[PDB]
Amino acid sequence: GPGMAVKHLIVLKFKDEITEAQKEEFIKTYVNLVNIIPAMKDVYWGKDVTQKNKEEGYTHIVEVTFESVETIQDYIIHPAHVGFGDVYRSFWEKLLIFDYTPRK
Amino acid sequence: GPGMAVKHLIVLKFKDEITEAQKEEFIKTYVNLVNIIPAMKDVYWGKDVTQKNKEEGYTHIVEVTFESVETIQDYIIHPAHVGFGDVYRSFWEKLLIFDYTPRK
Ligand SMILES: CCCCCCCCCc1cc(O)cc(O)c1C(=O)O
Ligand SMILES: CCCCCCCCCc1cc(O)cc(O)c1C(=O)O
């Protein structure tokens, strides 16, 4: 179509002791970044329900739509993104980061 | 619309010896499954461009929409899916699978 987009995909595992209340606060603050970082055009997330890689332990997936890899860079270095890591890095055990253009 | 569908997300790293042409043939013959497996509605895929995961170097991402976890499981055991997985399993080094309903 006429618009171009790049998807920023994050896969996440929280540390075992993190509470559901803490996860909720974490996620609310993350999705709120759309009100702070204009590069972020869409945010959708979900929790895995099938546990096909239970041993690896990733549970959460977030998809963020951007116009280009250049605006993704603006999001990465935005002070609110750095600050989110400052406050919440201690909540996650591991992450996977991907940037790609979905195609058929 | 109000529908509550489920996304099937696959993240993959091929073995180092697999050629680009072989990866493309794998993807092409994976997308052909939409024509064979009733549950498989659509497929989008992409190649990661930012390479941020260090020792966990997944390269390819595929997203498939399904009605439900049950119809995902239909796709898993369908003989054309079993056959695809059987004969290409030696292609990949790392594989993660997630099933989730995207939400805001
Ligand atoms: C519904 C779950 C919300 C998960 C939010 C995860 C935020 C991760 C922040 C981050 C940390 C990092 O060390 C490297 C990065 O690339 C990134 C990023 O892409 O945002
Ligand atoms: C653009 C790259 C295309 C990737 C195709 C990956 C095929 C994976 C087949 C499989 C094997 C398995 O052991 C378990 C599973 O759930 C599955 C699956 O979900 O399809």
PDB file of C-alpha atoms and ligand atoms in Angstrom:
ATOM      1  CA  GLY A   1       0.000   0.000   0.000  1.00  0.00           C
ATOM      2  CA  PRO A   2       1.014   3.663   0.060  1.00  0.00           C
ATOM      3  CA  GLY A   3       2.417   3.784   3.589  1.00  0.00           C
ATOM      4  CA  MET A   4       5.724   2.279   4.608  1.00  0.00           C
ATOM      5  CA  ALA A   5       6.253   0.776   8.020  1.00  0.00           C
ATOM      6  CA  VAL A   6       8.789  -1.194  10.004  1.00  0.00           C
ATOM      7  CA  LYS A   7       7.735  -3.403  12.891  1.00  0.00           C
ATOM      8  CA  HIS A   8       9.695  -3.345  16.147  1.00  0.00           C
ATOM      9  CA  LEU A   9       9.038  -6.675  17.902  1.00  0.00           C
ATOM     10  CA  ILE A  10      10.064  -7.349  21.505  1.00  0.00           C
ATOM     11  CA  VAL A  11       9.852 -10.753  23.218  1.00  0.00           C
ATOM     12  CA  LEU A  12      10.219 -10.670  26.985  1.00  0.00           C
ATOM     13  CA  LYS A  13      10.575 -12.835  30.076  1.00  0.00           C
ATOM     14  CA  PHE A  14       9.994 -11.258  33.473  1.00  0.00           C
ATOM     15  CA  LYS A  15      12.019 -12.332  36.465  1.00  0.00           C
ATOM     16  CA  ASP A  16      10.257 -15.073  38.396  1.00  0.00           C
ATOM     17  CA  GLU A  17       9.542 -12.987  41.513  1.00  0.00           C
ATOM     18  CA  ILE A  18       7.874 -10.086  39.657  1.00  0.00           C
ATOM     19  CA  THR A  19       4.218  -9.844  40.649  1.00  0.00           C
ATOM     20  CA  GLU A  20       1.284  -9.527  38.269  1.00  0.00           C
ATOM     21  CA  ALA A  21       0.682  -6.081  39.785  1.00  0.00           C
ATOM     22  CA  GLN A  22       4.252  -5.132  38.888  1.00  0.00           C
ATOM     23  CA  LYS A  23       3.863  -6.489  35.355  1.00  0.00           C
ATOM     24  CA  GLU A  24       0.696  -4.403  34.975  1.00  0.00           C
ATOM     25  CA  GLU A  25       2.511  -1.224  36.064  1.00  0.00           C
ATOM     26  CA  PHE A  26       5.435  -2.032  33.747  1.00  0.00           C
ATOM     27  CA  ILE A  27       3.154  -2.609  30.763  1.00  0.00           C
ATOM     28  CA  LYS A  28       0.979   0.456  31.430  1.00  0.00           C
ATOM     29  CA  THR A  29       4.088   2.631  31.551  1.00  0.00           C
ATOM     30  CA  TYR A  30       5.542   1.051  28.409  1.00  0.00           C
ATOM     31  CA  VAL A  31       2.405   1.461  26.284  1.00  0.00           C
ATOM     32  CA  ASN A  32       2.082   5.030  27.605  1.00  0.00           C
ATOM     33  CA  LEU A  33       5.305   5.869  25.757  1.00  0.00           C
ATOM     34  CA  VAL A  34       3.127   6.501  22.703  1.00  0.00           C
ATOM     35  CA  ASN A  35       2.094   9.719  24.524  1.00  0.00           C
ATOM     36  CA  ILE A  36       5.742  10.700  24.900  1.00  0.00           C
ATOM     37  CA  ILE A  37       7.679   9.363  21.894  1.00  0.00           C
ATOM     38  CA  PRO A  38       5.956  10.501  18.679  1.00  0.00           C
ATOM     39  CA  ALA A  39       7.828   7.961  16.547  1.00  0.00           C
ATOM     40  CA  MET A  40       5.713   5.174  18.123  1.00  0.00           C
ATOM     41  CA  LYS A  41       2.676   4.845  15.850  1.00  0.00           C
ATOM     42  CA  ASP A  42       0.964   1.693  17.176  1.00  0.00           C
ATOM     43  CA  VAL A  43       1.523  -0.594  20.162  1.00  0.00           C
ATOM     44  CA  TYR A  44      -0.092  -4.039  20.493  1.00  0.00           C
ATOM     45  CA  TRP A  45       0.974  -6.694  22.971  1.00  0.00           C
ATOM     46  CA  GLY A  46      -0.017 -10.115  24.167  1.00  0.00           C
ATOM     47  CA  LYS A  47       0.804 -12.931  26.535  1.00  0.00           C
ATOM     48  CA  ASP A  48       1.712 -16.343  25.157  1.00  0.00           C
ATOM     49  CA  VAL A  49      -0.876 -18.999  26.004  1.00  0.00           C
ATOM     50  CA  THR A  50       0.658 -22.201  24.596  1.00  0.00           C
ATOM     51  CA  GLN A  51       4.082 -22.366  26.298  1.00  0.00           C
ATOM     52  CA  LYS A  52       5.718 -24.189  23.385  1.00  0.00           C
ATOM     53  CA  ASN A  53       9.160 -23.013  24.598  1.00  0.00           C
ATOM     54  CA  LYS A  54       8.405 -23.137  28.320  1.00  0.00           C
ATOM     55  CA  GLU A  55      12.033 -23.817  29.214  1.00  0.00           C
ATOM     56  CA  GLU A  56      13.199 -20.578  27.570  1.00  0.00           C
ATOM     57  CA  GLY A  57      10.428 -18.845  29.467  1.00  0.00           C
ATOM     58  CA  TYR A  58       9.470 -15.888  27.270  1.00  0.00           C
ATOM     59  CA  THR A  59       5.857 -14.914  27.974  1.00  0.00           C
ATOM     60  CA  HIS A  60       5.206 -11.454  26.532  1.00  0.00           C
ATOM     61  CA  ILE A  61       5.262 -10.101  22.987  1.00  0.00           C
ATOM     62  CA  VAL A  62       4.904  -6.460  21.952  1.00  0.00           C
ATOM     63  CA  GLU A  63       4.657  -5.142  18.388  1.00  0.00           C
ATOM     64  CA  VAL A  64       5.355  -1.450  17.755  1.00  0.00           C
ATOM     65  CA  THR A  65       4.797   0.093  14.329  1.00  0.00           C
ATOM     66  CA  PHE A  66       7.224   2.750  13.079  1.00  0.00           C
ATOM     67  CA  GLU A  67       7.630   4.678   9.835  1.00  0.00           C
ATOM     68  CA  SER A  68      11.277   3.678   9.298  1.00  0.00           C
ATOM     69  CA  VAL A  69      14.393   2.322  10.961  1.00  0.00           C
ATOM     70  CA  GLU A  70      15.426   5.957  11.424  1.00  0.00           C
ATOM     71  CA  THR A  71      12.415   6.716  13.607  1.00  0.00           C
ATOM     72  CA  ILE A  72      13.057   3.455  15.485  1.00  0.00           C
ATOM     73  CA  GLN A  73      16.478   4.880  16.322  1.00  0.00           C
ATOM     74  CA  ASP A  74      14.794   8.059  17.596  1.00  0.00           C
ATOM     75  CA  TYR A  75      12.686   5.901  19.915  1.00  0.00           C
ATOM     76  CA  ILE A  76      15.699   3.919  21.139  1.00  0.00           C
ATOM     77  CA  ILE A  77      17.676   7.024  22.140  1.00  0.00           C
ATOM     78  CA  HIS A  78      14.708   9.038  23.375  1.00  0.00           C
ATOM     79  CA  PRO A  79      15.273  10.024  27.029  1.00  0.00           C
ATOM     80  CA  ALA A  80      11.962   8.413  28.018  1.00  0.00           C
ATOM     81  CA  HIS A  81      13.106   5.123  26.489  1.00  0.00           C
ATOM     82  CA  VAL A  82      16.453   5.343  28.298  1.00  0.00           C
ATOM     83  CA  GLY A  83      14.534   6.257  31.458  1.00  0.00           C
ATOM     84  CA  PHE A  84      12.150   3.329  31.070  1.00  0.00           C
ATOM     85  CA  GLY A  85      15.206   1.070  31.087  1.00  0.00           C
ATOM     86  CA  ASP A  86      16.658   2.934  34.060  1.00  0.00           C
ATOM     87  CA  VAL A  87      13.577   2.189  36.173  1.00  0.00           C
ATOM     88  CA  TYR A  88      12.386  -1.166  34.787  1.00  0.00           C
ATOM     89  CA  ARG A  89      15.418  -3.067  33.453  1.00  0.00           C
ATOM     90  CA  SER A  90      15.496  -4.907  36.781  1.00  0.00           C
ATOM     91  CA  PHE A  91      12.087  -6.431  35.988  1.00  0.00           C
ATOM     92  CA  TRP A  92      13.078  -8.510  32.953  1.00  0.00           C
ATOM     93  CA  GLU A  93      15.223 -11.631  32.837  1.00  0.00           C
ATOM     94  CA  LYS A  94      15.745 -11.554  29.102  1.00  0.00           C
ATOM     95  CA  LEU A  95      14.623  -9.908  25.903  1.00  0.00           C
ATOM     96  CA  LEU A  96      14.740 -10.457  22.161  1.00  0.00           C
ATOM     97  CA  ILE A  97      14.566  -7.418  19.837  1.00  0.00           C
ATOM     98  CA  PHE A  98      13.648  -7.536  16.138  1.00  0.00           C
ATOM     99  CA  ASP A  99      13.087  -4.918  13.446  1.00  0.00           C
ATOM    100  CA  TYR A 100      11.579  -6.022  10.160  1.00  0.00           C
ATOM    101  CA  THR A 101       9.222  -5.112   7.366  1.00  0.00           C
ATOM    102  CA  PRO A 102       6.418  -7.698   7.188  1.00  0.00           C
ATOM    103  CA  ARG A 103       5.725  -8.954   3.693  1.00  0.00           C
ATOM    104  CA  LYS A 104       3.767 -11.704   1.992  1.00  0.00           C
TER     105      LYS A 104
ATOM    106  CA  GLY B   1     -14.187  -5.524  14.518  1.00  0.00           C
ATOM    107  CA  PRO B   2     -14.932  -7.295  17.784  1.00  0.00           C
ATOM    108  CA  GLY B   3     -13.298 -10.593  16.811  1.00  0.00           C
ATOM    109  CA  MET B   4     -10.966 -12.431  19.194  1.00  0.00           C
ATOM    110  CA  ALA B   5      -8.488 -14.253  16.945  1.00  0.00           C
ATOM    111  CA  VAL B   6      -5.086 -15.631  17.906  1.00  0.00           C
ATOM    112  CA  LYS B   7      -1.716 -14.894  16.334  1.00  0.00           C
ATOM    113  CA  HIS B   8       0.904 -17.618  15.840  1.00  0.00           C
ATOM    114  CA  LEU B   9       4.392 -16.093  15.874  1.00  0.00           C
ATOM    115  CA  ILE B  10       7.498 -18.014  14.832  1.00  0.00           C
ATOM    116  CA  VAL B  11      11.071 -16.777  15.328  1.00  0.00           C
ATOM    117  CA  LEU B  12      13.833 -18.710  13.588  1.00  0.00           C
ATOM    118  CA  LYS B  13      17.584 -18.945  13.065  1.00  0.00           C
ATOM    119  CA  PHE B  14      18.781 -21.129  10.200  1.00  0.00           C
ATOM    120  CA  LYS B  15      21.942 -23.190  10.392  1.00  0.00           C
ATOM    121  CA  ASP B  16      24.962 -21.264   9.127  1.00  0.00           C
ATOM    122  CA  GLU B  17      25.411 -23.532   6.092  1.00  0.00           C
ATOM    123  CA  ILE B  18      21.959 -22.776   4.652  1.00  0.00           C
ATOM    124  CA  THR B  19      22.185 -20.521   1.612  1.00  0.00           C
ATOM    125  CA  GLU B  20      20.006 -17.494   0.981  1.00  0.00           C
ATOM    126  CA  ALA B  21      18.424 -19.334  -1.966  1.00  0.00           C
ATOM    127  CA  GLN B  22      17.617 -22.267   0.318  1.00  0.00           C
ATOM    128  CA  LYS B  23      16.070 -19.997   2.947  1.00  0.00           C
ATOM    129  CA  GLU B  24      13.875 -18.444   0.262  1.00  0.00           C
ATOM    130  CA  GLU B  25      12.741 -21.879  -0.964  1.00  0.00           C
ATOM    131  CA  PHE B  26      11.869 -22.787   2.648  1.00  0.00           C
ATOM    132  CA  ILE B  27       9.804 -19.616   3.026  1.00  0.00           C
ATOM    133  CA  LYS B  28       8.084 -20.082  -0.335  1.00  0.00           C
ATOM    134  CA  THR B  29       7.100 -23.650   0.469  1.00  0.00           C
ATOM    135  CA  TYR B  30       5.923 -22.574   3.953  1.00  0.00           C
ATOM    136  CA  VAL B  31       3.621 -19.899   2.512  1.00  0.00           C
ATOM    137  CA  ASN B  32       2.177 -22.484   0.117  1.00  0.00           C
ATOM    138  CA  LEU B  33       0.671 -24.200   3.163  1.00  0.00           C
ATOM    139  CA  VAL B  34      -2.044 -21.533   3.310  1.00  0.00           C
ATOM    140  CA  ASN B  35      -3.541 -23.146   0.191  1.00  0.00           C
ATOM    141  CA  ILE B  36      -3.552 -26.602   1.826  1.00  0.00           C
ATOM    142  CA  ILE B  37      -4.298 -26.198   5.544  1.00  0.00           C
ATOM    143  CA  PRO B  38      -7.815 -24.817   6.212  1.00  0.00           C
ATOM    144  CA  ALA B  39      -6.897 -23.257   9.566  1.00  0.00           C
ATOM    145  CA  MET B  40      -4.003 -21.235   8.156  1.00  0.00           C
ATOM    146  CA  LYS B  41      -5.606 -17.938   7.163  1.00  0.00           C
ATOM    147  CA  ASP B  42      -2.719 -15.627   6.244  1.00  0.00           C
ATOM    148  CA  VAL B  43       1.062 -15.354   6.494  1.00  0.00           C
ATOM    149  CA  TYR B  44       3.374 -12.356   6.831  1.00  0.00           C
ATOM    150  CA  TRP B  45       7.110 -12.799   7.287  1.00  0.00           C
ATOM    151  CA  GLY B  46      10.192 -10.668   7.597  1.00  0.00           C
ATOM    152  CA  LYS B  47      13.943 -10.668   7.981  1.00  0.00           C
ATOM    153  CA  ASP B  48      15.432  -8.856  10.959  1.00  0.00           C
ATOM    154  CA  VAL B  49      17.663  -5.915  10.043  1.00  0.00           C
ATOM    155  CA  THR B  50      19.067  -4.713  13.373  1.00  0.00           C
ATOM    156  CA  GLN B  51      20.792  -7.890  14.668  1.00  0.00           C
ATOM    157  CA  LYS B  52      20.536  -6.968  18.351  1.00  0.00           C
ATOM    158  CA  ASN B  53      20.310 -10.364  20.056  1.00  0.00           C
ATOM    159  CA  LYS B  54      24.004 -11.361  20.209  1.00  0.00           C
ATOM    160  CA  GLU B  55      24.302 -15.087  20.946  1.00  0.00           C
ATOM    161  CA  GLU B  56      20.570 -15.586  20.214  1.00  0.00           C
ATOM    162  CA  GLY B  57      20.775 -14.554  16.562  1.00  0.00           C
ATOM    163  CA  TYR B  58      17.301 -15.275  15.226  1.00  0.00           C
ATOM    164  CA  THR B  59      16.931 -13.837  11.727  1.00  0.00           C
ATOM    165  CA  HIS B  60      13.434 -14.577  10.471  1.00  0.00           C
ATOM    166  CA  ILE B  61       9.970 -13.853  11.819  1.00  0.00           C
ATOM    167  CA  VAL B  62       6.638 -15.209  10.593  1.00  0.00           C
ATOM    168  CA  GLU B  63       3.168 -14.206  11.760  1.00  0.00           C
ATOM    169  CA  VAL B  64       0.093 -16.326  11.026  1.00  0.00           C
ATOM    170  CA  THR B  65      -3.475 -15.521  12.057  1.00  0.00           C
ATOM    171  CA  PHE B  66      -5.749 -18.286  13.307  1.00  0.00           C
ATOM    172  CA  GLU B  67      -9.249 -18.522  14.729  1.00  0.00           C
ATOM    173  CA  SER B  68      -8.100 -20.058  18.018  1.00  0.00           C
ATOM    174  CA  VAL B  69      -5.496 -22.130  19.827  1.00  0.00           C
ATOM    175  CA  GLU B  70      -7.477 -25.210  18.797  1.00  0.00           C
ATOM    176  CA  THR B  71      -7.164 -24.368  15.106  1.00  0.00           C
ATOM    177  CA  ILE B  72      -3.470 -23.610  15.571  1.00  0.00           C
ATOM    178  CA  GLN B  73      -3.261 -27.167  16.887  1.00  0.00           C
ATOM    179  CA  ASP B  74      -5.147 -28.351  13.784  1.00  0.00           C
ATOM    180  CA  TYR B  75      -2.405 -26.712  11.710  1.00  0.00           C
ATOM    181  CA  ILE B  76       0.336 -28.294  13.829  1.00  0.00           C
ATOM    182  CA  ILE B  77      -0.858 -31.867  13.218  1.00  0.00           C
ATOM    183  CA  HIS B  78      -2.034 -31.399   9.630  1.00  0.00           C
ATOM    184  CA  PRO B  79       0.002 -33.806   7.463  1.00  0.00           C
ATOM    185  CA  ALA B  80       1.237 -31.020   5.196  1.00  0.00           C
ATOM    186  CA  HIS B  81       2.539 -29.152   8.235  1.00  0.00           C
ATOM    187  CA  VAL B  82       4.029 -32.308   9.789  1.00  0.00           C
ATOM    188  CA  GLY B  83       5.602 -33.091   6.425  1.00  0.00           C
ATOM    189  CA  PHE B  84       7.064 -29.602   6.058  1.00  0.00           C
ATOM    190  CA  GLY B  85       8.455 -29.675   9.580  1.00  0.00           C
ATOM    191  CA  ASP B  86       9.817 -33.208   9.229  1.00  0.00           C
ATOM    192  CA  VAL B  87      11.796 -32.550   6.072  1.00  0.00           C
ATOM    193  CA  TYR B  88      13.098 -29.067   6.876  1.00  0.00           C
ATOM    194  CA  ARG B  89      13.773 -29.471  10.615  1.00  0.00           C
ATOM    195  CA  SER B  90      17.461 -30.018   9.899  1.00  0.00           C
ATOM    196  CA  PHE B  91      17.462 -26.514   8.326  1.00  0.00           C
ATOM    197  CA  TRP B  92      17.128 -24.536  11.538  1.00  0.00           C
ATOM    198  CA  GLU B  93      19.309 -24.066  14.609  1.00  0.00           C
ATOM    199  CA  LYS B  94      16.913 -22.172  16.904  1.00  0.00           C
ATOM    200  CA  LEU B  95      13.106 -21.942  16.877  1.00  0.00           C
ATOM    201  CA  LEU B  96      10.649 -20.159  19.161  1.00  0.00           C
ATOM    202  CA  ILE B  97       6.863 -20.312  18.894  1.00  0.00           C
ATOM    203  CA  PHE B  98       4.297 -17.989  20.519  1.00  0.00           C
ATOM    204  CA  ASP B  99       0.491 -17.909  20.440  1.00  0.00           C
ATOM    205  CA  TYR B 100      -1.262 -14.796  21.687  1.00  0.00           C
ATOM    206  CA  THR B 101      -4.156 -12.436  21.127  1.00  0.00           C
ATOM    207  CA  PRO B 102      -2.811  -8.923  20.436  1.00  0.00           C
ATOM    208  CA  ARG B 103      -4.339  -6.213  22.587  1.00  0.00           C
ATOM    209  CA  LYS B 104      -3.797  -2.557  23.390  1.00  0.00           C
TER     210      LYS B 104
HETATM  211  C1  LIG C   1       3.993  -5.945  26.833  1.00  0.00           C
HETATM  212  C2  LIG C   1       5.478  -6.047  27.159  1.00  0.00           C
HETATM  213  C3  LIG C   1       6.206  -4.706  27.102  1.00  0.00           C
HETATM  214  C4  LIG C   1       7.701  -4.986  26.979  1.00  0.00           C
HETATM  215  C5  LIG C   1       8.553  -3.723  26.870  1.00  0.00           C
HETATM  216  C6  LIG C   1      10.049  -4.042  26.718  1.00  0.00           C
HETATM  217  C7  LIG C   1      10.916  -2.786  26.616  1.00  0.00           C
HETATM  218  C8  LIG C   1      12.377  -3.089  26.273  1.00  0.00           C
HETATM  219  C9  LIG C   1      13.253  -1.832  26.197  1.00  0.00           C
HETATM  220  C10 LIG C   1      14.557  -2.183  25.492  1.00  0.00           C
HETATM  221  C11 LIG C   1      15.634  -2.541  26.271  1.00  0.00           C
HETATM  222  C12 LIG C   1      16.830  -2.886  25.687  1.00  0.00           C
HETATM  223  O1  LIG C   1      17.910  -3.233  26.489  1.00  0.00           O
HETATM  224  C13 LIG C   1      16.966  -2.886  24.322  1.00  0.00           C
HETATM  225  C14 LIG C   1      15.890  -2.536  23.545  1.00  0.00           C
HETATM  226  O2  LIG C   1      16.056  -2.553  22.169  1.00  0.00           O
HETATM  227  C15 LIG C   1      14.675  -2.190  24.108  1.00  0.00           C
HETATM  228  C16 LIG C   1      13.543  -1.802  23.160  1.00  0.00           C
HETATM  229  O3  LIG C   1      13.585  -2.160  21.955  1.00  0.00           O
HETATM  230  O4  LIG C   1      12.600  -1.075  23.565  1.00  0.00           O
HETATM  231  C1  LIG C   2       9.947 -17.055   7.310  1.00  0.00           C
HETATM  232  C2  LIG C   2      10.413 -18.347   7.977  1.00  0.00           C
HETATM  233  C3  LIG C   2       9.338 -19.434   8.001  1.00  0.00           C
HETATM  234  C4  LIG C   2       9.420 -20.237   9.296  1.00  0.00           C
HETATM  235  C5  LIG C   2       8.721 -21.593   9.247  1.00  0.00           C
HETATM  236  C6  LIG C   2       8.945 -22.352  10.555  1.00  0.00           C
HETATM  237  C7  LIG C   2       8.268 -23.723  10.546  1.00  0.00           C
HETATM  238  C8  LIG C   2       8.162 -24.326  11.942  1.00  0.00           C
HETATM  239  C9  LIG C   2       7.398 -25.659  11.977  1.00  0.00           C
HETATM  240  C10 LIG C   2       7.213 -26.050  13.446  1.00  0.00           C
HETATM  241  C11 LIG C   2       8.075 -26.977  14.026  1.00  0.00           C
HETATM  242  C12 LIG C   2       7.935 -27.328  15.364  1.00  0.00           C
HETATM  243  O1  LIG C   2       8.788 -28.274  15.955  1.00  0.00           O
HETATM  244  C13 LIG C   2       6.942 -26.745  16.129  1.00  0.00           C
HETATM  245  C14 LIG C   2       6.089 -25.820  15.559  1.00  0.00           C
HETATM  246  O2  LIG C   2       5.079 -25.218  16.320  1.00  0.00           O
HETATM  247  C15 LIG C   2       6.221 -25.461  14.233  1.00  0.00           C
HETATM  248  C16 LIG C   2       5.205 -24.432  13.740  1.00  0.00           C
HETATM  249  O3  LIG C   2       4.575 -23.759  14.595  1.00  0.00           O
HETATM  250  O4  LIG C   2       4.955 -24.275  12.520  1.00  0.00           O
END
